[PDB]
């Protein structure tokens, strides 16, 4: 019937002034564009069919052609930026927004999907979809007493499209749009569907990836406890965005980091810092590095949760990127910590792995390690135990690495190693 048509036949059908022939040809086009192996999007565009599909979007008395054209345009907009642009240039944004309020659920869902693709292209088309007034009708679709009454796929698509409306930077989404979307996002963050939860966490992670004012917008809604609860979820697709959002939040002020701590986040990091997925370990160690850059009481809370041994472990054995995050965490710890906290760090066995890491080729990690060692030596100076620390570093074989770095290409490493050897060795 409408299977395996040529673009020539599709064009002939769509060009006829017979609405049923147009509908059949549009369905054939939808089936072509819905094929997994190289859908012929460029051929459909060159045939000039986008304006016809956009016009069909407005055929209220023929809902099937509305649906078929919306599906075809969705799949066109799912491609490159040029193909999404071809869809936008045909006037599809206002037509899809008008279809959001369709009495046919599948047509409204298809419009949500298409707008999601368009907005996911980037910040420009995101803001253009916002300017055409999509947020109000999108959120009106979720204005139900209980989200469980909605179809699962419909709700997942709405959540994903909203996440795309929260996505991308330079510029970030308009402040008023974020404020308009956030309450529904909190409500969705309390939903029970794993995919809805994952996409809501991704939206929150987007919204928290920015200056402290954006983070504050998010945290004032009271979402941090729910984010911590989701951080301890079993589904990796949920933990990943939740951990990203928590890390973004702790990149902010000390009070926002403290809101993360008060919600019980640290208690999850024994598992996160040993998680078998390298990405989780890296993100969690980065989050820890940003928590150790906070106040001394926050470093103390890190200590009380028994997380210093886990940082020692990550420093001893992990993917190099995770080890570099751990080096940063140790340097921040030593920069902001008390003398007691630093000697505790040393008692947990940090010196040996911190020195073994000096054999790396990256210069930044070497400089970070040297700064951490300088801070540790300063604490020892205040305790009059610099000779014991020097003996410890010498037994580990770190003095050899430092005297070798004295011949390093970078100026900072050269000077720091020479200063260490002249002041303590």
């Amino acid at each position: 019937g409408t299977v395996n048509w040529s673009v020539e036949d599709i064009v002939k059908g769509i060009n006829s002034n017979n609405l049923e022939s147009q509908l059949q040809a549009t369905q054939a086009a939808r089936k072509l564009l819905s094929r997994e192996k190289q859908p012929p999007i460029d051929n459909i565009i060159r045939a000039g069919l986008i304006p016809k599909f956009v016009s069909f979007l407005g055929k209220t008395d023929c809902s099937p052609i509305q649906f078929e054209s919306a599906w075809a345009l969705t799949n066109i907009a799912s491609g490159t930026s040029e193909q999404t642009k071809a869809v936008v240039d045909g006037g599809a944004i206002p037509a899809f927004i008008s279809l959001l309020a369709s009495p046919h659920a599948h047509i409204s869902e298809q419009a949500v999907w298409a707008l999601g693709n368009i907005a996911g292209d980037g910040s420009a088309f995101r803001d253009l979809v916002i300017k055409h007034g999509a947020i109000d009708p999108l959120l009106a679709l979720l204005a139900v007493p209980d989200l469980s009454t909605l179809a699962c796929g419909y709700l997942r698509n709405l959540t994903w499209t909203l996440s795309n409306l929260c996505r991308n930077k330079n510029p970030a989404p308009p402040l008023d749009a974020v404020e308009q979307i956030l309450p529904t996002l909190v409500r969705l963050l309390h939903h029970n569907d794993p995919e809805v939860l994952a996409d809501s966490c991704w939206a929150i992670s987007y919204l928290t990836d920015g200056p402290n004012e954006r983070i504050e917008m998010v945290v004032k809604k009271g979402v941090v406890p729910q984010l911590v609860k989701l951080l301890g979820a079993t589904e990796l697709p949920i933990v990943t965005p939740a951990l990203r959002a928590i890390g973004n939040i702790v990149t902010g002020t000390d009070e926002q980091t403290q809101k993360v701590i008060d919600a019980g986040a640290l208690a999850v990091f024994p598992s996160l810092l040993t998680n078998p997925k390298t990405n989780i370990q890296k993100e969690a160690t980065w989050t820890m590095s940003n928590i150790t850059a906070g106040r001394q009481d926050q470093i103390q809370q890190v200590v009380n949760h028994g997380l210093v041994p886990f940082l020692v472990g990550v420093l001893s054995k992990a993917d190099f990127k995770t080890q570099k995050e751990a080096a940063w965490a140790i340097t921040n710890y030593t920069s902001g910590g008390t003398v007691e906290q630093i000697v505790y760090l040393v008692h947990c066995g940090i010196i040996e792995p911190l020195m073994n890491l000096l054999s790396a080729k990256d210069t930044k990690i070497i400089q970070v390690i040297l700064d951490a060692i300088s801070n540790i030596f300063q604490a020892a100076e205040k305790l009059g135990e610099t000779e014991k620390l020097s003996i410890m570093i010498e037994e580990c074989g770190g003095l050899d690495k430092i005297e070798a770095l004295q011949r390093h290409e970078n100026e900072s490493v050269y000077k720091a190693s020479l200063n260490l050897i002249e002041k303590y060795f």
């Binding site: 859908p39 298809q110 693709n117 996911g120 850059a293 921040n332 920069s335």
Partner: peptide, 11 residues
């Protein structure tokens, strides 16, 4: 001690 900071086809 300083802080350090898609599309879908319908088949």
């Amino acid at each position: 001690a300083r802080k350090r900071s898609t599309k879908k086809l319908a088949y």
